[model samples]
Target: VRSEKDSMGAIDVPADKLWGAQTQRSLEHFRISTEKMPTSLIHALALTKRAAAKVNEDLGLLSEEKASAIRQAADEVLAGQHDDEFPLAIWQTGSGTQSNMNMNEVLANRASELLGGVRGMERKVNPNDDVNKSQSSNDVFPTAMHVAALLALRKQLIPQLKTLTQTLNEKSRAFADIVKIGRTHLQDATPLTLGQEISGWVAMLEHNLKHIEYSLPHVAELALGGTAVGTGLNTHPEYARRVADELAVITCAPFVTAPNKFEALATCDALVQAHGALKGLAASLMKIANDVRWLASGPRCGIGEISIPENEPGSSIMPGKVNPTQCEALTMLCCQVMGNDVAINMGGASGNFELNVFRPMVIHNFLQSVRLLADGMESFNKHCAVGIEPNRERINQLLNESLMLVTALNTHIGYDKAAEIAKKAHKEGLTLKAAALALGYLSEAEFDSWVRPEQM
Candidate 1:
């Protein structure tokens, strides 16, 4: 262990750890959860610091040598070289000040070492004055949240969703000729092609993708320049814009400074909007998963029109039974995402006048939603959607037995007559054709012509 000092006091830190006083203090104080902050947030913080160093050097606020050293150290962190240094819990300091200072301390110490200085030497590269120059935890933390979320949504979530959509689309084409009975309110309603049903699922996901894309512009706007309380204090006038431009080049994603720093600092509405899109996605996925599991319910007894791949044994004692595990997993994840939306909404609303205190909660839930949806889609696609097979004989047999087919006879034999035929068919467990013929509603040729499931 080694001694480190900050404005508060001195503390003993692990000798091999790259963190300094503020981080050590936080580690000692916050033992709420073993869960550390997400690595995407850490990488985003490193990217922010790297861009800030370049901007500061260009603006002549930092020396070229110090900026270069900072860049080198930050790049290393960005590449995940020092992931263990950030051990602060997600529950610490509502403003995420501890995490921000943790990153600052790590960067400063590592950069100082790069310049031939030992650890804990603030003179070589001060954590707050140099590493966090012209920035406050209020702005930097939120900015990091934006960066991490947008990158994850773009690079990970959207692509996986697209893959799922594509897989559903392929099934739509594959099932184009397979006719099946459609249900409303869990009751048989009408006849539709299985392809059309799959197409509807694809439409749901595509709409969600569009919604997510629509919400991203607001998320790309960062709160970096609004130091302290959105006044941009102790910072150059163009620092925000320059830093954003630098970040854009580094991340290959467009980032912009928030127009109203006060709004950006005070509320996490942008994240809320993004998470709202994710919630929509979760709901859509839940519907899809339920539909899938219902379709794949029972090979012997339930409404098993489609068969899913048997990836695992369904029971410990039952013999030769398989369950829709993928669909179950997807549904469970969707439920979690829905629950996370509630937490995110409450956290987003927890913001006061000057700053939002629920940033860590908001980002944590948002990322969880994104990761769950992404991974859920991938698993559902690979395990369920692609391997689905329609039970052609079962589907055709059910279609022939459905009483709703009498609806076609409504226009031919009158509504009352069709209703009587359907009622008799349901009461006596007869096919629509048999009931219609027995009721003198139609001939066999007429019934076959008008009540064709394929035509419907």
Candidate 2:
């Protein structure tokens, strides 16, 4: 073990660990849950450090020697060189102070070591002074939160949604000519091409994608300029713009410093708004998955209009049973993502007067929602959606047998006569032809000409 000290006092830390006294204390204090801060957050925090070092150097607030050392260390951290150095839990100090300090200490120790100083000694490179210059956890944590959420949505989840949507689009075109019976309240209503039905699912995904895309611009705004309590305290005049500009180059996004630091620091509305989009995606996935499973329910017993890939043996005792496991898994992920939205909304609203204290929880749930939706949606597409095959024989059989086709005769005969034909066919288990001829509603020749499924 080695000794390190923060503002409180000196303490013994694990010798191999790159973190210092503050991190060591938080690690020991917050043994609350198994949930650690996400790697995306850590990487975003490192990038924030890298941007700060470059900006501080550009403004002549930091010496090139210290700035260069800090930049190299932050780059290494961004490359995931020191992942284990971050050990603080998500449940730690609501403002994520421990996490910011964890990044500060890890970079400072690694920077000092890179400059030929011992790792545990703060004599050369200090965590608060050298690394976290002109920054506070309040602003730094929220700024990183925005960057991390934006990356998770844009860089990761958006691609997954596109891939799945493309496969569904192809399926819609493939099933274009297949006429199938449509259901409104789980009852046969009318006839439409199967491709037309699948197109609705495609539309759902496209609309949900729009929700996520539209919310991104709001999230691109960062809270870095608000050092503490919305004031650029102890910071250089050009620090805010310069740091935000550096981050834009680093992240390749149009990130700007918040015009009003007070609002940025005090509220997490951007994250909440973005997470509402995730919730919309989850809701759409739920509808898609439920429709898939219902349509693919039974090989011989249920709807049987479509067949999905049989991923695994569904039952332990029933020998030939294969279930829609991918659909089941995706639906469960949707429920979890929806539940995460609730936590984020409450967390987003819990901020008091000057600063929101629920920063860690909000980001944790936001990232979780994105990861769960993306990964699970991809799995569903690969195992189920891409393998979806129309049961043409069953579709034709149901379409030919549905009583709703009598509605086509309404323009020829009348609405009451068509209704009578449908009711007679359903009551007697006879074909619509027999019921129409028995009720004298229309000639058999007329029924054949007007009741064509293709025309409807």
User: TM-score, each model?
Assistant: 0.94, 0.95
TM-score of 1: 0.94
Pairs that collide, model 2:
none
Q: Pick the candidate with the highest TM-score.
A: 2
* Residue 160, model 2: Cα distance from true site in angstroms: 1.5
Model-by-model lDDT, in order? Answer: 0.89, 0.89
lDDT of 1 by residue, 38-79 (tens): 989999989999999999999999999899999999989878
Write model 2 residue lDDT over 98-167, tens digit each, in one string: 9999998988888888888879874478899889988999999999998898888888899999999999
Candidate 1: misplaced stretches above 4 Å? 314-320, 409-424, 434-450
**Predicted candidate 1: what Cα RMSD to the true structure?**
2.1
Candidate 2's C-alpha runs over 4 A off are 313-320, 437-446
